[PDB]
Amino acid sequence: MLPLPDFTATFPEPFPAGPHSERTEHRLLDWLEEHPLLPSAKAKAVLVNITSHGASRTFPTADADDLLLFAELLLWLTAFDDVHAEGNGVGGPAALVDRASELMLVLAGGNPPRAMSPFPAVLHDLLARFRARASAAAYHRLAASLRDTLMALVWEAHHVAKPEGVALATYLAMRPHTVFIKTITAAGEILLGYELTDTQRALAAVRNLETAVANLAGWINDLASYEREMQRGRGQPLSLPTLLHARHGGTIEEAFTRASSMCENEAAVARRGITHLAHASPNALTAHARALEDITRSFIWHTSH
Amino acid sequence: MLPLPDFTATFPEPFPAGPHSERTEHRLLDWLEEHPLLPSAKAKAVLVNITSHGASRTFPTADADDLLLFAELLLWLTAFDDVHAEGNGVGGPAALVDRASELMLVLAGGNPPRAMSPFPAVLHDLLARFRARASAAAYHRLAASLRDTLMALVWEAHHVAKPEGVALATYLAMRPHTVFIKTITAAGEILLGYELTDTQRALAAVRNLETAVANLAGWINDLASYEREMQRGRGQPLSLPTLLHARHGGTIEEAFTRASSMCENEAAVARRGITHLAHASPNALTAHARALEDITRSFIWHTSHA
């Protein structure tokens, strides 16, 4: 059954949820007809549904048009990972490198040469709509987190064949970029209408909460998907329980217990960080703490639902 | 000898040069003693020299400390390419990916790194000094060009084994990122104290001049480096003449002749774009045209310095 972490004491339910869940689901299905990103229909249906209801917990104060824009970005990102960045890595990472490079050319701007994948064209439009709605610095921070995510996905694919060759400390540093937490946070500043200055971003209070939330998000995703992705046949996954297992021996069950303990300690650090930051005088710091609270609540929720 | 392009009609000499070449050369050699990034000593000497004197043509009006910071970044970048990239890495592209990923983490922010490679710690210092020198948008555009170059280097490492599997249209789009022009241009906006708005950056005149200049820089470098990288005992390099040679058959000389024509046409395009943008306009557009003019001059000067 494998032990899971308990966030009742750190992020208890109920989780606030915006009203736009159902409309987002249907406007998302409209958008997908024009650009087919998922190969199956039930893949499409289940992803659109969880993205929409998940999107509603991530930004409950939302804005129907805004939440749909975020949901489209998060779904584009999730679809690209599932399509060009999974499997056991037979045939290697070069195909994903080629796809990531096409997307770099879009992020760099200027209309690159056309690609037979639909992912560059949708990204181009998503960036354009975010560019308008965002300040300019907020836009490039969003575009930077996408650049880092693509490099981290490329890193993962060069190690999926041999997950035991990866240092735990390196995985801990890289995983925030493949769980998409920085893009969600950057899109959050845009849609929620706040923005930190570079001196606020350097505050230990901000950095430490961001680190704690990024750890929580990647690790709970690792644990929630581990039994799923091993019974898939090929191999131990490149995820937290695998690397703990290699580090300490013992059983996979023992690796899950310390990982569950790690998450609950990390959830406790996030909660103290949210409290410490919500007592900030500036509205931008207190808005950031509250935004990161909901983003986290929604990562926890996706493990349930 | 192989046919090479002639830019007399578009970028004639003399190329203006700042006063700081020799100071920058000495300051670079001291800095490299503190952090050894190049494996050889004669390699170090030749690279420091062209990097320092070239920087004086790239930004002839920069002061010495700005100039050394740029030269340090360009040398850091060139050294990283020589060590880990362009086929030179044992362990394949996965090793380069591991190194590029460490550098992505410095770019994403985050504290001074404790890494076995010396490149992350130097980038951390260089980015900080650029950060203090620049507005926030200009800093993140510099950091973005570095991120894009890293992905492009990884792409290159997955195609060196079979350069003819690369479509020309793809190579032409990718090569600007491995010749570093976007990082030099972004460093130029900071050091020269100008900044385009994002609507100015979408200007057809801006886009077309930047494209012409980026093509010129990668292609001129491909021709100057082909014979070197032909004699290192692997295949043909992943470069413009190789792809033309495969595209049209014939001999490498015929491919060089076709590349030279492409460069001179691109230089004529660049010169018209600089002339067009030079007309009054917002101060940021005309400063950009002048900055790209000098950047182009130093790429051409680089080949002569031989």
3-state secondary structure B194-228: CCCCHHHHCCHHHHHHHHHHHHHHHHHHHHHHHHH
Say yes or no for a CB contact (<8 Å) between A148 and B108: yes
Residue A156 labeled ligand binder = yes
Residue B148 labeled ligand binder = no
Pull the structure tokens for residue B229.
Answer: 């990288």
* CB distance A113 to B170 below 8 Å: yes
Method for this entry: X-ray
CA distance B12 to A253: 72
- Please name the residue of chain B whose CA is at the shortest distance from the CA of residue A201: B109
CB count, 10 Å around CB of B62?
23
Among B88, B187, B208, CA closest to B145: B187
Tell me the longest C-alpha to C-alpha distance in chain A.
54
Inter-helix orientation angle A204-230/A240-248, to 10°: 90
Cis ω for the linkage preceding B60 (within 30 of 0): no
What's the distance, CA B28 to chain centroid?
18
DSSP single-letter state for residue B282 = -
CA distance B275 to A87: 53
Q: In sequence order, what are the residues at sequence separation of 6 or more whose Cβ sits closer than 8 angstroms to the Cβ of residue B266? A: B212, B215, B216, B219
Q: In sequence order, what are the residues at sequence separation of 6 or more whose Cβ sits closer than 8 angstroms to the Cβ of residue A29? A: A44, A48
Residue B229 labeled ligand binder = yes
DSSP single-letter state for residue A9 = T
Residues in chain A: 305
* CB distance B263 to B216 below 8 Å: yes
Vertex A123: Cα angle to A96 and B205 (nearest 5):
110
* CB distance B196 to B284 below 8 Å: yes
In the block, which residue shows the tokens 């190049």?
B38
Ramachandran class of A249: left when φ > 0, alpha when ψ lies in -120 to 50, beta otherwise? left
Q: Is A196 on the interface with B (CB under 8 A)?
A: no
* CB distance A166 to A238 below 8 Å: yes
- Please name the residue of chain B whose CA is at the shortest distance from the CA of residue A182: B108
Pull the structure tokens for residue B84.
Answer: 């880990």
Amino acid at B153: L
Q: How far apart are the first and last CA of chain B?
A: 14
Domains of chain A listed by start with CATH number: 1-305 (1.10.600.10)
Pull the structure tokens for residue B15.
Answer: 């190329």
Pull the structure tokens for residue B45.
Answer: 């000497």
CB count, 10 Å around CB of A287?
20
Interface of A with B in 147-166 (CB under 8 A): 147-148, 150-152, 154-155, 158-159
* CB distance B287 to B190 below 8 Å: no
Q: In sequence order, what are the residues at sequence separation of 6 or more whose Cβ sits closer than 8 angstroms to the Cβ of residue A107? A: A123, A127, A143, A146, A147, B144, B148
CA distance A284 to B226: 54
Q: Is A60 helix (H, G, I), strand (E, B) or coil?
A: coil
Among A274, A269, A270, CA closest to A286: A274
CA distances from A223 to A57, A175, A239 (A): 21, 13, 8
Q: Name which of B137, B152, B169 is nearest A140 (Cβ-Cβ).
A: B137
Q: Is B41 on the interface with A (CB under 8 A)?
A: no
CB count, 10 Å around CB of B68?
22
Q: Name which of B131, B154, B170 is nearest A97 (Cβ-Cβ).
A: B154
Pull the structure tokens for residue B89.
Answer: 């890495």
Q: Name which of A137, A174, A201 is nearest B101 (Cβ-Cβ).
A: A174
CA distance A18 to A54: 10
- Which of A98, A102, A105 has the highest number of chain B CBs within 10 A, making it the mutation to test binding with B? A105
Say yes or no for a CB contact (<8 Å) between A97 and B141: no
CA distances from B239 to A108, A147, B90, B236, B268 (A): 21, 25, 21, 8, 22
CA distance B44 to B138: 30
CA distance B195 to B200: 10
Ramachandran class of A15: left when φ > 0, alpha when ψ lies in -120 to 50, beta otherwise? beta
CA distance B18 to A119: 46
Across A47-80, b (16+ Cβ under 10 Å) vs e yields bbbbbbbbbbbbbbebbeebbbbbbbbbbbbbbb
Pull the structure tokens for residue B218.
Answer: 């990668």
CA distance A59 to A45: 21
Q: Name which of A108, A141, A182 is nearest B148 (Cβ-Cβ).
A: A108
CA distance B209 to A104: 21
* CB distance B168 to A111 below 8 Å: no
Say yes or no for a CB contact (<8 Å) between A147 and B144: yes
Inter-helix orientation angle B64-84/B136-157, to 10°: 20
Among B306, B219, B211, CA closest to B255: B219
Helices within chain A (DSSP H only): 21-34, 41-58, 64-84, 94-107, 119-133, 136-157, 168-178, 181-192, 198-201, 204-230, 240-248, 252-278, 283-304
Vertex B33: Cα angle to B44 and B78 (nearest 5):
40
Amino acid at A38: L
Helix (H) or strand (E) holding B120: helix B119-133
- Using a 10 angstrom Cβ sphere, with 0-12 exposed, 13-18 middle and 19 or more buried, the burial of residue A33 is exposed
* CB distance A127 to A144 below 8 Å: no
Among A271, A294, A89, A305, CA closest to A188: A294
Among B277, B275, B274, B136, CA closest to B203: B277
CA distances from A107 to A125, A146, A252, B102 (A): 11, 8, 40, 21
Pull the structure tokens for residue A178.
Answer: 């493949």
* CB distance B226 to B153 below 8 Å: no
How many contacts (CB atoms, under 8 Å) link A and B? 99
- Using a 10 angstrom Cβ sphere, with 0-12 exposed, 13-18 middle and 19 or more buried, the burial of residue B248 is exposed
CA distance A103 to A169: 28
* CB distance A171 to A244 below 8 Å: no
Q: In sequence order, what are the residues at sequence separation of 6 or more whose Cβ sits closer than 8 angstroms to the Cβ of residue B233? A: none
Helices within B134-167 (DSSP H only): 136-157
Residue B221 labeled ligand binder = yes
Q: Is B120 on the interface with A (CB under 8 A)?
A: no
Among A219, A247, A218, A170, CA closest to B114: A170
Inter-helix orientation angle B240-248/B252-277, to 10°: 120
* CB distance A299 to A263 below 8 Å: no
Torsion angle (degrees, nearest 10) of CA B51, B52, B54, B55: 100
Q: Is B62 helix (H, G, I), strand (E, B) or coil?
A: coil
Q: In sequence order, what are the residues at sequence separation of 6 or more whose Cβ sits closer than 8 angstroms to the Cβ of residue B133? A: B66, B69, B190, B191
Vertex B176: Cα angle to B173 and B181 (nearest 5):
155
Q: In sequence order, what are the residues at sequence separation of 6 or more whose Cβ sits closer than 8 angstroms to the Cβ of residue B232? A: none
Sign of CA dihedral B254, B256, B262, B264: negative
DSSP single-letter state for residue A235 = -
Expressed in percent and rounded to 5, the helix, strand and coil fractions of chain B are: 70, 0, 30
What's the distance, CA A204 to chain centroid?
22
A chain contacts of residue B109, beta-carbon cutoff 8 Å? 201
DSSP single-letter state for residue B159 = T
Residue A229 labeled ligand binder = yes
Say yes or no for a CB contact (<8 Å) between A174 and B211: no
Inter-helix orientation angle B136-157/B168-179, to 10°: 130
CA distance A139 to B137: 10
Say yes or no for a CB contact (<8 Å) between A94 and B158: yes
Say yes or no for a CB contact (<8 Å) between A101 and B152: yes
DSSP single-letter state for residue A116 = S
* CB distance A50 to A305 below 8 Å: yes
Amino acid at A270: A
CA distance B108 to B102: 10
* CB distance A303 to A224 below 8 Å: yes
In the block, which residue shows the tokens 């990034």?
B37
Among A290, A281, A142, A289, CA closest to A206: A289
CA distance B88 to A141: 33
Cα-trace Rg, chain B:
19
B chain contacts of residue A139, beta-carbon cutoff 8 Å? 198
User: B84-93 — which CB contacts under 8 Å span 24+ positions?
Assistant: B84/B153, B85/B153, B85/B156, B85/B157, B86/B153, B86/B156, B86/B157, B86/B160, B86/B178, B86/B229, B87/B157, B87/B160, B87/B234, B89/B157, B92/B157, B93/A97, B93/A158, B93/B154, B93/B157, B93/B158
Q: In sequence order, what are the residues at sequence separation of 6 or more whose Cβ sits closer than 8 angstroms to the Cβ of residue A127? A: A106, A107, A143
Tell me the three-class secondary structure of B2-61, residue by residue.
CCCCCCCCCCCCCCCCCCCHHHHHHHHHHHHHHCCCCCCHHHHHHHHHHHHHHHHHHCCC
Pull the structure tokens for residue B224.
Answer: 């100057």
* CB distance B83 to B89 below 8 Å: yes
Cα-trace Rg, chain A:
19
Residue B210 labeled ligand binder = no
A chain contacts of residue B181, beta-carbon cutoff 8 Å? none
Q: Is A127 on the interface with B (CB under 8 A)?
A: no
Q: How far apart are the first and last CA of chain A?
A: 17
CA distance B18 to B207: 28
